[PDB]
Design a protein around this ligand. Structure first.
Ligand SMILES: O=C(Nc1nncn1C1CC1)[C@@H]1CCOc2ccc(Cl)cc21
Ligand SMILES: O=C(Nc1nncn1C1CC1)[C@@H]1CCOc2ccc(Cl)cc21
Lengths: 304, 304
């Protein structure tokens, strides 16, 4: 028993991290097969970032200007192309440590692991949720750009995120591996509004089920609610409206614990309206939303 | 910016995980050089666990009874020895993925990463603190035994923990890699008191410094305190007494932020006495103690 904010084992992704330098800028790249993926802003100077014309900036660059280093060996760049906000550097050598992989665009509310890197070297790994407003609350310093987010289903790594920037508000923005930003963001040093964020209701409910499985039950009450009634409370507390699709995804946890989804919604309703009264749930003094129902089942069943 | 409960990249440890089976029991082993380390209770049946005589149980076992499997290949066992609560299985092949490593006994209050495994396969990675009472609050199911805790300083993995058991209270107990339990615990299915736990004061202060560095400053006040005054509050709130050694370790963070350690102690004192008033610090509604001062400096400086 016990419940932790667990990240995927990062080994398969560590073997793909490289350092990419263009001019005076160094960031991280992802080497998969004979292609290295990195944020296109590697071609900019901090000065260019105010309003970069990436097409014009990239035209001044040649294959030999992109220095790609994997550990201590240099990779020979034989092609370069920009796809949305990422650069794809074709190298002459396929990465021998390339795992089975996929590029996926995750949905808001879904979770993933981030392998934070600097100069192509891994520094740490943590579990994130893509916020409903398409930002992530990460831990990223200068040079972390190009660090990736991913999920792993047995031997296949699904890469879902590449880090590009920190907004003036301190939250993080990035792209899928085709270079499409999650959210309205642009790779430019300008003030950018991230939308109103909300709490991922289905994840809080999944985490309440994890609490019951792992022994924390003080919050269970004698009440029930309806999707309509619960959603009036979710509206007031800036929670995502619960749908039947969310109730359906909670099915396995509801079956495991014997607690009907709407009964768990009534516990959540009372927690929203009354707070925790100085108590904790799974070591937390707030309602946690960075665990999906799939994460709870996975962690509680020991999937490797 | 941003501050996360970051684990070390687990790759170097993933390459050392093996499955060890003896009779009907399967757990995880750590393969380093030509030795596989695992909890000695792999030789027990669930029935033997009430009061096992490990010496007698091990005498009925031969090298061929220990099935060690690394991925899909079988390792040939040529020796077996029990050292405290661990078994050391000498194999005929050195692990080709053996990283530079050390076995270290960490101190209470120090942190480490756990690579949770089942059947020799990694399931996830999370960052833990060894509690002052020598337990850890992990996420471990049946078969997780033998999963290890570790730290990494550039290319050297310092293994500090091997998981053995879950106490009736749901907290976890284990040994260093020489098989010596952290705490008063015995590898036997009996009720075992874990001592009164306390909050790791120096870690809460380190985390408050991390909060200031990363923008959360609402808790800073116009007050100061003394080690004596602060310790009277620490006593009342079940916090570890702060010493000059702890103040000394906080030196770099104090220098970085310009906030004297005793001024940060006065902020902590007011937070203990008044609570958070429904506010958060680094996304938490409680005082976090699972980040050491070294962790804060490391994360805030991007050490890889
Ligand atoms: O955001 C960026 N860096 C960043 N992203 N995660 C961590 N960090 C560092 C600041 C802490 C760069 C530098 C700031 O100016 C920009 C502007 C646009 C773009 Cl795409 C990137 C950048
Ligand atoms: O504790 C153990 N298992 C455990 N440790 N982390 C997770 N888990 C499973 C229960 C959830 C085993 C089984 C219970 O009985 C004992 C007794 C003594 C020893 Cl050393 C091990 C054990």
């Amino acid at each position: 028993s016990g419940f932790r904010k667990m990240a995927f084992p990062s080994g398969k992704v560590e073997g793909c991290m490289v350092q990419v330098t263009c001019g005076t800028t160094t960031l991280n790249g992802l080497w998969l097969d004979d292609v290295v993926y990195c944020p296109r802003h590697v071609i900019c100077t901090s000065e260019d970032m105010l309003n970069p014309n990436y097409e014009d900036l990239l035209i001044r660059k040649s294959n030999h200007n992109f220095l790609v280093q994997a550990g201590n060996v240099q990779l020979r760049v034989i092609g370069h192309s920009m796809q949305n906000c990422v650069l794809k550097l074709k190298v002459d050598t396929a990465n021998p440590k390339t795992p089975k992989y996929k590029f996926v665009r995750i949905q808001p509310g879904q979770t993933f692991s981030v392998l934070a890197c600097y100069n192509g070297s891994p520094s740490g790994v943590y579990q994130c949720a893509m916020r409903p407003n398409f930002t992530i609350k990460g831990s990223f310093l200068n040079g972390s750009c190009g660090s990736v987010g991913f999920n792993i289903d047995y031997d296949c790594v699904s890469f879902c995120y590449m880090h590009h920037m920190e907004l003036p508000t301190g939250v993080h923005a990035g792209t899928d591996l085709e270079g499409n930003f999650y959210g309205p963001f642009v790779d430019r040093q300008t003030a950018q509004a991230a939308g109103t964020d909300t709490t991922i209701t289905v994840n809080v409910l999944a985490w309440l089920y994890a609490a019951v499985i792992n022994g924390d039950r003080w919050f269970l009450n004698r009440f029930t609610t309806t999707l309509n009634d619960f959603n009036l409370v979710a509206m007031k507390y800036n929670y995502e409206p619960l749908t039947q699709d969310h109730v359906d995804i909670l099915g396995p946890l509801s079956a495991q614990t014997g607690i009907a989804v709407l009964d768990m919604c009534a516990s959540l309703k009372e927690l929203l309206q009354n707070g925790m009264n100085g108590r904790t749930i799974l070591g937390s003094a707030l309602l946690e939303d960075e665990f999906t129902p799939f994460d709870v089942v996975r962690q509680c069943s020991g999937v490797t």
